[PDB]
Automatic annotation (TrEMBL):
Keywords: Heme, Iron, Metal-binding. Heme binds at Y74. Heme b binds at Y74, R141. InterPro entries: HasA_haem-bd, HasA_haem-bd_sf. This is Hemophore HasA. It comes from the Bacteria. One of its GO terms (molecular function) is metal ion binding. It comes from Yersinia pestis.
Length: 177
């Protein structure tokens, strides 16, 4: 089952209120110019467009960031679809690089989803419109564009209550203080 760990400073927030705050501050990646448009980084595999971790911070001089872990694949040219399976999804602030030999961490961890089972399939013979409708792609793309609604819809479809405060959510445990 999906469970959640949360920093006690967010005990009164819900998934919805937290992600709306996080996404507003992360901002829309597509409104950043190339020089500062940070498309994130993969680690965990010896190749460029896939990995066991994907980490991305705001392109708008704000500290918000998110980390996904799982079997993470990006189809690159020509359909640019994120697919595979996200097992862990973490939101917070202040991404920093781990020691080399590797990946990133959030210096301020706010919310972590454990065993999220957020997946998407890619079929090169389907259109870009259809491939972009996979749960993993639409939800992560939306967050990158400052829009938490697709991820919230995916979480509701998983039976996760996105309106309950973390302190009252039966699947959520506070991080120790």
């Amino acid at each position: 089952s999906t469970t959640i760990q949360y920093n006690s400073n967010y005990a009164d927030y819900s998934i919805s209120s937290y992600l709306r705050e996080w996404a507003n501050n992360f901002g829309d990646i597509d409104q950043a110019p190339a020089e500062t448009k940070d498309r994130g980084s993969f680690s965990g595999s010896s190749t460029l467009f896939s990995g066991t971790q994907y980490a991305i911070g705001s392109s708008h001089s704000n500290p918000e960031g998110m980390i996904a872990e799982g079997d993470l694949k990006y189809s690159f040219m020509p359909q640019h679809t994120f697919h595979g399976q996200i097992d862990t999804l973490q939101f917070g602030k202040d991404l920093a690089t781990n020691a080399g030999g590797a990946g990133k961490h959030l210096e301020k961890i706010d919310i972590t989803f454990n065993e999220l089972d957020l997946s998407g399939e890619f079929d090169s013979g389907k259109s870009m419109t259809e491939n972009h409708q996979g749960d993993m792609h639409k939800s992560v793309r939306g967050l990158m564009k400052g829009n938490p609604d697709p991820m919230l819809e995916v979480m509701k479809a998983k039976g996760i209550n996105v309106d309950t405060a973390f302190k009252d959510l039966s699947i959520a445990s506070q991080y120790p203080d």
